[PDB]
Write a protein that binds this ligand. Sequence first.
Ligand SMILES: Cc1ccc(C)c(Cn2c([C@H](O)c3ccncc3)nc3ccc(-c4cnn(C)c4)cc32)c1
Lengths: 147, 141, 119
Amino acid sequence: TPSDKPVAHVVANPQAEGQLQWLNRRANALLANGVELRDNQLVVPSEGLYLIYSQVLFKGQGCPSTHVLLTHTISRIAVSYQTKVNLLSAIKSPCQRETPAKPWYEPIYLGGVFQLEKGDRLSAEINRPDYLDFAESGQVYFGIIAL
Amino acid sequence: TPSDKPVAHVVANPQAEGQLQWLNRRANALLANGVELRDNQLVVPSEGLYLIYSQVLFKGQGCPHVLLTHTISRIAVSYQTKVNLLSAIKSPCEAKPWYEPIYLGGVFQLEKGDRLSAEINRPDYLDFAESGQVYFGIIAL
Amino acid sequence: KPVAHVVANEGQLQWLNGVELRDNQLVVPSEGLYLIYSQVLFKGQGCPSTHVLLTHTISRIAVQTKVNLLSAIKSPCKPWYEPIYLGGVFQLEKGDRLSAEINRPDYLDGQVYFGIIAL
Ligand SMILES: Cc1ccc(C)c(Cn2c([C@H](O)c3ccncc3)nc3ccc(-c4cnn(C)c4)cc32)c1
């Protein structure tokens, strides 16, 4: 007998270079028990505690003239307050100095447990999609699990 | 009454050289309700939504650049292909010692007979200081 | 199904909440398979002179020895943030106790919790 818990695990679209496009229609991605993917956002079908999680992976070749700040932010748009409240975020600086040019890899991971309401819209956003790495699958993903 | 959910929590072997070797014959390690451990892979006994998870802990004594990787993969019987579900790549860098835990998890639709691997590139960098540091599991929902 | 999910409060890591919370420890009420999970978040401002290691550990106090179930270590060395995630499935006994602890409650900061679910 299947579980009735709302869950989702969506993944970056690897041919959408220069963007972060979440897919549920791809090998090993899923929407279940009422969770929708609408306008690049996950939509919560019932109230409760959810674990939210996400990973993005950034990659560059050597360090450029201008200072690089990589961010990843998960936000919540409630029906009763329809503007992005940040739930989780992290900043990373992959580069100490300008390359005086080996690859660097900087992942950012965000997870937490939050109360959510029906109709909640969750977004998972980066500032620099030009540094995303879509080399193989499994690197960039976003999901929720009702507790 | 005991739960009939397929479950597994397997643990890395501290004395397998140049290898990430999963064990279930240890304390607080576990195969139950159909899950098998064959060729270092966990084998699913039935269709369903599963939680899947793995931790690995890397440790180096200083910095000369090193890349660390950690990947959970699926092989579906029906497709006979090997495909990543979760994957992390990470540059960790008198010599003071660094630690890098990588914890991979998510929920997935799995089919009867699927085989799952949890793999890294630098077994020489695994740390076994304490128990509980390197592990691999699945939980039917 | 027995479930708990507790969270932090200073000075220490104290958990404010048919699973009981006796002595900052969750107490198993029946024998079976449990999913157990936790996270903690550490904050500092700048790097100290003495080398700091942050650990986080979930232990099973059986029924009376004490053994790691899940554990990890981070080395942080401009403000910084380092989380630590733990989670897995375990066969437990009626009356076993579970601790989720850290070594440096001084660097402790949604993201700080501990819980178990009977499967
Ligand atoms: C993404 C993921 C997949 C599998 C597992 C075992 C975990 C472990 N876990 C953790 C763990 O701190 C973590 C790990 C990775 N991302 C976010 C959090 N917190 C949890 C908080 C809650 C739960 C939880 C409670 N019920 N269910 C069905 C899952 C698990 C939780 C995380």
